[PDB]
Amino acid sequence: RKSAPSTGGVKKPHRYKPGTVALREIRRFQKSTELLIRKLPF
Amino acid sequence: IEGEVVEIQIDRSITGGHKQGKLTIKTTDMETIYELGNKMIDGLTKEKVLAGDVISIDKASGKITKLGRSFARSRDYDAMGADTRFVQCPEGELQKRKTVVHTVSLHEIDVINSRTQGFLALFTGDTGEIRSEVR
Amino acid sequence: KETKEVYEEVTELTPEENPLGGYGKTISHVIVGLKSAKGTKTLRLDPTIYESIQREKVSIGDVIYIEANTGAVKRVGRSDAYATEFDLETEEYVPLPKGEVHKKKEIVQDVTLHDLDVANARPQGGQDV
Amino acid sequence: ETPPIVIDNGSYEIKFGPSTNKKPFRALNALAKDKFGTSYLSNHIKNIKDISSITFRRPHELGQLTLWELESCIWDYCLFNPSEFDGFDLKEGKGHHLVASESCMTLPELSKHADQVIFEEYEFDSLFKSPVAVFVPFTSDYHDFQLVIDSGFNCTWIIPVLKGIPYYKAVKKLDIGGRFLTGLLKETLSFRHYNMMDETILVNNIKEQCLFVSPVSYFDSFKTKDKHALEYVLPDFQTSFLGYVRNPRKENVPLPEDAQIITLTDELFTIPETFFHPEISQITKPGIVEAILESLSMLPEIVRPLMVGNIVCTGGNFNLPNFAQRLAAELQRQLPTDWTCHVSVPEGDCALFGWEVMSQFAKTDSYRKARVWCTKHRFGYQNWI
Amino acid sequence: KLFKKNNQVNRVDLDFLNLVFTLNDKDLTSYHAEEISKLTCVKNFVEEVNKLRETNKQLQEEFGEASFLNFQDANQYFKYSNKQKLEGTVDMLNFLKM
Amino acid sequence: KALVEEIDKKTYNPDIYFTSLDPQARRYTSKTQQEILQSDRRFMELNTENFSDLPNVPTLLSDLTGVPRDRIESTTKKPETLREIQLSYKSTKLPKPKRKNTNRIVALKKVLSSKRNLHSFLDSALLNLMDKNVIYHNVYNKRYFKVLPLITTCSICGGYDSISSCVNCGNKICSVSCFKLHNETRCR
Ligand SMILES: Nc1ncnc2c1ncn2[C@@H]1O[C@H](COP(=O)(O)OP(=O)(O)O)[C@@H](O)[C@H]1O
Ligand code: BEF
Ligand SMILES: [Mg+2]
Ligand SMILES: [Zn+2]
Ligand SMILES: [Zn+2]
After folding, report:
1. What are the cysteine partners in each disulfide bond (chain B)?
2. Adjacency order of strands within the sheet including D5-6
3. Which residue, among D92, D173, D118, has the nearest Cα to D375 in the 3D structure?
4. Nearest-CA residue for atom 9 of ligand 1
5. In angstroms, what is the span from residue D287 Cα to ligand 2's centroid?
């Protein structure tokens, strides 16, 4: 025989990306200018 | 190895092991902790070592050099009544291997070798015709 | 010239009793073991050597060389096998000897009769008067 | 056909070929489930250009071999394809003989099922299976008493052999094996560098090509690491998929391949030290020396020095350099002066050594005795206790 | 320390050679001296050194000075324990004759 | 020592003299399962060759060993094999018996299955191995730890010389900088 079933069908590489850039920016650039309450209520 | 100590831990013999010991030693820069060596309990109990003094240990010799008390903060150490010669400021790092240069003459060496305690003969002058083969 | 057979860590030690007499207490035998490098080997001996090694103040786990000629043994030191037993110590590290359990070596000595007769006349010993 | 096909069922590679050629062929036994949309056979994994996205399901696990479908597919792709493997052709094998290799820890159910699978799918008229240690006596002419170490891909084994027959009462196993060097190697590389994911061949080939085994202890290795360093370049997954070896004194290639030069001074020696002092790796494994001394202690004193007198090694764990002299120095210790031990380990290569051993065994009368209840008195190890 | 380090190498025991004899005076007579120094020299050790040379020959017939250990003495361990004793005891009796 | 010592007729403890000088809270010298649990967890990780498989590793070790995954993961940070062997090739293998159920399996389980798994293999009841482990591993004893147990080389800088241990974590440190950052960041 060989392999009658399978022969692939679905494969997908993924995971990470959104947080990597944020962490590299944080490590290579400090963070400041924190959140302020909405202007119109004040 | 030198550095200011805080207290000394000397324990007795119990079922689990030989003894218990954990010396915390402080300096100007960084402060850590070490453990006993069985013989070191006897070495530290030989003299009444006060807690919190700058004492140096050479593991190659094991000789305690109680140069002075722990400087640390002198607010509690402002009225010793002389003593310790203005203690000493801790140097920080502890792991140090410094060479010792000693100058001696041939007479001292041969006098030391001659008798059981040649230093006393050196300090008294009773060498008494040292033999040539030693020389 | 003279040849010498010497036996050189220590695996264990154990004495072996009723003296069958007016003596207080003793050991019929003493069995010990030496590690060395070229294989280990146990050793059976007389409580005299046990007494001598006790006077040498040697730990059970330690490196020991014992003289077969007369039985004189000195503390070689803390062997390298039991390194960093505690955080801080003072005993020498004494790397374990590389050789057979028992070793025979040839010794050649050059002396003068002047050393001989002064050695003969001068007394020796320990605590004797 | 008297000469059989020399099939060596191995977790990493299954050897095959006729019983006549002097060079056995290679075929990796694994599936490359590539995440990018493709799947490869047992011999289509070395020609792929993307590695940062893969997750394989090897048929061999910690216990035994599991994925029978993959094993059968690899078998029929290997034997029924003569173009890929020159000189390897067999259509059914009704009259062909077969030799198989498997671990000693095989369960009776596995033995029955596998032997029936062979007998029904391949219809081999005669066959014989035994652990790798049983081939050592076949090296009368065939030997009687040897001590065999089977440092397998899954688990390392200790086999005492008397009268050409294994002594399963004192058999010892130690899981420390292949499967593991790459483990702490990758863990240390990840701890000292950035985080790399979805890769299984970088660390394995790194171990295969640019590591060795602990000159004599941890001390020599951990100070001599600086002077004997080697900066293996990690193949950046954006453009590259395979790396090469570099050393500060014999630079093979000095060009930065996608930059990122990794300095491998430390952690060159961890796994080569877990074989004796796993406490460094924070694992409670005994070690190979403790296992062998325990097995010898269980063995009667009449037979103890005979097994230590002739030591042999089986498996690919000894392919890497700096292995024979360390084990020789170790066995020099432990054993007292009363009993003397002689080192006769194979010079490195062992899978091919076992292949040659079974090739020789196919040409002697030992194969004609226990050749085909089948898993009981011929493939069964109870008659050899 | 720099001096008392070669005593483990070049030390020679003059007492072992009986060269400190002056200190060993007040414990000995001669009626045992000559008698033992002759009897142990010839007749007490003729039955011992020759017997232990016979144990050397026994080792030789045992296995080729341990040459045929894994092929001849493989299945017999009692002869192994005889062979460990023979050469050791003959070397010890050589030490005894010295 | 100085002559004449004053004793207050209390304490009178010639050998004992300390208060704690701990900076360690717990009892290091005197009064486990965590060690063996982390050992088996990091051993299964030692089996794994993938970092993307690391999330899947606890599931595999829970399925293989049989211990619940949740408790092990919280604390620490072959019948099954026969099962997927049987279900793997349902279309090919034919499990037909040949009297094997009453001829060999008894002594087979006596000899091979005397210890069910690797954990039992390393702790066999036919002889002693844990005490053998302690005897061979001439590094540390059990229970009463008179040495304040510690760890390996410099974990950050990669240095080798002047190794020592931080007071709280016990994480080994060497030289400076890494000896300082592995103390400040790992100050527990
Ligand atoms: N480069 C290498 N370095 C270290 N070990 C290796 C290397 N290559 C292969 N090995 C080891 O050699 C072992 C050979 O095992 P094998 O004989 O296939 O086991 P089995 O006979 O049970 O199939 C593998 O399990 C792996 O542990
Ligand atoms: F399983 Be192996 F590498 F032979
Ligand atoms: Mg193999
Ligand atoms: Zn560091
Ligand atoms: Zn800490």
Report:
1. none
2. D5-6, D98-101, D127-130
3. D118
4. D316
5. 20
Structural domains in chain B, sorted by start: 1-100 (2.40.50.360)
What helix, strand, coil percent values describe chain D, rounded to 5? 30, 15, 55
Ligand 1, atom 5: closest residue by C-alpha: D317
What tokens does F35 get?
């060690």
- Are 3 or more Cβ–Cβ pairs between D and B shorter than 8 Å? no
Our CA angle for E75, E77, E79, nearest 5°, is: 110
Please give the sequence-ordered ranges of beta strands (E in DSSP) within chain C, or none if there are none: 2-7, 10-15, 30-34, 41-45, 63-67, 73-77, 102-107
**Structural domain span for residue D226:** 178-274
Q: How does strand B53-57 pair with strand B64-69?
A: antiparallel
Tokens standing for residue F78:
């072959």
- The 3-state DSSP class for residue B109 equals helix
Separation CA B100–CA F173 (nearest Å): 28
Do the chains contact at B35 and C90, CB–CB below 8 Å? no
What is the C-alpha to C-alpha distance for residues D11 and F166, in angstroms, rounded to an integer? 44
Whether chain A has a CB inside 8 Å of the CB on D36: the answer is yes
Residue D143 Cα distances to D121, D140, D166, angstroms:
35, 7, 12
User: Exposed, middle or buried by CB within 10 Å (0-12, 13-18, 19+), for F96?
Assistant: exposed
User: Contact D310/E70, CB-based, under 8 Å?
Assistant: yes
The strand pair at D98-101 and D5-6 is best described as parallel
CB contact burial B66-99 (16+ within 10 A = b; e otherwise): eebbbbbeeeeeeeeeeebeebbebeeebeeeee
CB of D320 closer than 6 angstroms to any ligand 1 atom: yes
Residue with the smallest CA separation from ligand 2 atom 2 is: D12
Helix, strand or coil, per DSSP, at residue B117: coil
C-beta of residue D102 within 8 angstroms of C-beta of residue D129:
yes
Resolution of this deposited model, Å: 3.8
Q: How far is A12 from chain D (nearest CA, A)?
A: 5
- Long-range contacts (CB closer than 8 Å, 24 or more residues apart) made by C56-60: C58/C10, C60/C10, C60/C12, C60/C13
Helix (H) or strand (E) holding F20: none
Query: Residue E90 and residue E55: Cα distance in Å, rounded?
Result: 7
Query: Encoding tokens for residue F157?
Result: 């800088």
Contact call for residues F122 and D290 (beta carbons, < 8 A) = no
Q: How many CB pairs under 8 A join C and F?
A: 8
3-state secondary structure at position D340: coil
Asked if A8 contacts D38 with a C-beta cutoff of 8 angstroms, the reply is: yes
Q: What are phi and psi of D25, to 5 degrees?
A: -90, 165
User: How many other C-beta atoms can be found within 10 angstroms of the C-beta atom of residue D333?
Assistant: 15
Nearest Cα residue to D384 out of D218, D160, D86: D160
Which alpha helices (DSSP H) does chain D contain, by range?
68-79, 108-117, 181-192, 202-210, 218-223, 270-274, 288-298, 304-309, 324-332, 351-361
Q: Do residue C86 and residue B57 have CB atoms under 8 angstroms apart?
A: no
| Residue B57, number of CB atoms within 10 A of its CB | 23
C-alpha D300/C-alpha D316 separation (Å) is 30
The answer to whether the CB of F112 falls within 8 A of the CB of D168 is yes
Find the CATH number of the domain harbouring D261.
3.90.640.10
Q: Say yes or no for a CB contact (<8 Å) between C86 and B59.
A: no
Q: Locate breaks in chain B with C to N over 2.5 A; list the residue preceding each.
A: none
**CA distance linking residue F59 with residue F43, whole number of Å:** 14
Residue D297 CB less than 6 A away from ligand 1: no
Secondary element (H or E) of residue D6: strand D5-6
Ligand showing the shortest atom-to-Cα distance for residue D150: 1
Coil vs helix vs strand at F61: helix
Token couple for B80 = 């010793």
DSSP-assigned states of every residue in D217-248? SHHHHHHTTTTT---PBP--TTT-S--B---S
